[PDB]
Design a protein around this ligand. Structure first.
Ligand SMILES: NC(=O)Nc1nc2ccc(C3=C(C(=O)O)CCC3)cc2s1
Length: 166
């Protein structure tokens, strides 16, 4: 949890322009959040990147979790190993608003973060899930009460989020 180079947005939300895979390798946090889907199939975006950085160990573990427990619900989560990236991976499902899933569930998704004192995380429902990323940061600020270190890869998006928030 020895994070460095973050900008403090609120009492408990920090942001950095960084690849979440590189941040996890440098800090080895207690918890890294994955932007997952209900079957834990890590095909692209942040999920694909975290799974590739584990050389597919995360996907084999996720498949066994699904065969034993069934899929997650939208807004839900599960805790699995963080492999070489973290002690634990918190897999969280934000709504895919491009598929008609309710934006109301983005608040439920971020509520999962409150079970952990410190997290390294991406914005939820951004990218292929279709939510506006600045809206997703606002829900994060309004819902998360524990200490969250947000990593945003794209510099253009990062600059827009810092300008809209500060
Ligand atoms: N080594 C890697 O491949 N790392 C990463 N691959 C992605 C892919 C998508 C993203 C996304 C966003 C971003 O933070 O720029 C907002 C939407 C999806 C972030 C990473 S970090």
């Amino acid at each position: 949890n020895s994070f460095s180079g973050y900008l403090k947005l609120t009492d408990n939300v920090y942001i950095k322009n960084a690849d979440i895979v590189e941040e996890a390798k440098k800090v080895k946090p207690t918890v890294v959040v994955n932007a997952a889907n209900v079957y834990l199939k890590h095909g692209g975006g942040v999920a694909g990147a975290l799974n590739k950085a584990t050389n597919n160990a995360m996907q084999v573990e996720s498949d066994d979790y699904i065969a034993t427990n069934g899929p997650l619900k939208v807004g839900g989560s599960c805790v699995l190993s963080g492999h070489n990236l973290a002690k634990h991976c918190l897999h969280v499902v934000g709504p895919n608003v491009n598929k008609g899933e309710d934006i109301q569930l983005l608040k439920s998704a971020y509520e999962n973060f409150n079970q952990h004192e410190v997290l390294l995380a991406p914005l939820l429902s951004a990218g292929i899930f279709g939510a506006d990323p600045i809206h997703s940061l606002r829900v994060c600020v309004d819902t998360v009460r524990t200490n969250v270190y947000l990593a945003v890869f794209d510099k253009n998006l990062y600059d827009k989020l810092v300008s809209s928030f500060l």
